[PDB]
């Protein structure tokens, strides 16, 4: 194939290429990685994505082994490490602890201060005269608090900035040198080699503490393994939450009549949270799986070792699954969205994510009149990030 991937759609306007692919006859389409030249397959239709992501012979772990074709310009790991940290934790027998640190018990522990913080932040903005920046003044402190209090432990401001910077530098398709990307993973790993044990020991019930204290049959977790967990929690939790919350705010500010309904009918907020997860695009790339044997999906042969990608954004905008997919329609009763993926790799951060998204939507819904202070086309976007994010969101009442 000569069609290079990704499609350079760094703003909320999805590349028209996704619709062209969806409308093609084949359910799986060949592309080539811009960053590596590797051949890849790409799925954009909901019905095919379901079959792929629910078939465990298309392996997520195997899409990382050395030699695997990939979309990313560099491997998403510090050199010399395993980089399969979620598998390593599950292998060590910690699914129990992961459920306790990320599941409904964690939401019950944290939802109180998350909603308090969202309201405090929004209230401070409501008290200002003039304009403010919802990215710097709302999303950054809320997402930083989520990561510190629920995942990593008490971070200094400088530590928070280092991790934010490593995530933004390493999780990119372009904009920096390959060497700079690899070094961002190395810097993050070296940080947690030195400090993860200390962070696991700070006050709170954050996940890194729960992992460090848990019983493991093969003897407690080592320094390298705790450091691998740290890097995982940054890459999985920080740029996703910050990018999504920024994008969701832009969606809410562009749909005032939706917000006025939520203001009038607070019980409708959960439905709007689910529609944001469908409608708001986050990743500029795709989830990936490697065929572990010769496989055939909807009639296309995939050879052992080939990698198949699913664009969650394309699937969430598939008109065969959603009527009027490019309309923001809370309470549309269609199928489940793909914002958190599908099947056995469904985002385990989904409970905490929904908590922070719900808190954000309610903070907005309680205060009608919030609007962009510039036109949407004047919003400036970070170009090349895996997780789309605006540079600023100028806003006002
Ligand atoms: C902020 C909004 C978030 C969104 C939209 C999001 C989205 C996703 C998606 C789509 C996947 C599936 C990847 C795949 O199929 O290969 C995923 C996986 C994952 N997410 Fe999230 N995520 C978010 C936040 C978080 C948070 C806060 C955490 C941790 C606290 C987290 C931890 C993980 C982990 C560990 C995985 C890998 C699971 C596996 O491969 O089995 N995510 N996330
Ligand atoms: Br846009
Ligand atoms: Br629908
Ligand atoms: Cl899990
Ligand atoms: Cl879990
Ligand atoms: Cl509970
Ligand atoms: Cl007030
Ligand atoms: Na380079």
Numbering used by the authors: 2 to 398
The authors write:
Further, the in vitro assay confirmed that NasF5053 could produce NAS-C (47.4%), Asp-A (44.4%), as well as a minor product NAS-B (8.2%) (trace I). NasF5053 adopts the prism-like fold characteristic for P450s, consisting of a large domain of 10-helices (C-L) and a small domain of four α-helices (A, B, B’, and K’) and three β-sheets (strands β1-1 to 4, β2-1 to 2, and β3-1 to 2). Our systematic mutagenesis studies on the promiscuous NasF5053 and the versatile NascB identified four key resides, Q65, A86, S284, and V288, which play critical roles in controlling product regio-configurations and stereo-configurations. To obtain insights into the structural basis for regio-specificity, stereo-specificity, and chemical versatility, we further determined high-resolution crystal structures of wild-type NasF5053 in its substrate-free and substrate-bound form, and of two NasF5053 mutants (Q65I-A86G and S284A-V288A) in their substrate-bound forms.
Comparison between the substrate-free and substrate-bound NasF5053 structures reveals binding of substrates only invokes minimal conformational changes, with a root-mean-square deviation (RMSD) of 0.362 Å (for 388 Cα atoms) between the two forms. Instead, substrate binding is associated with rearrangements of some of the residues lining the substrate-binding cavity. Upon substrate binding, the side-chains of both D85 and E73 rotate along the Cα-Cβ axis away from the binding site, to accommodate the substrates. Q65 undergoes a 2.0 Å shift (measured on the Cδ atom) toward the binding site, to interact with one of the substrate molecules (cWL-PL-U; see below). Notably, Q65, D85, and E73 all reside in the long αB’-αC loop.
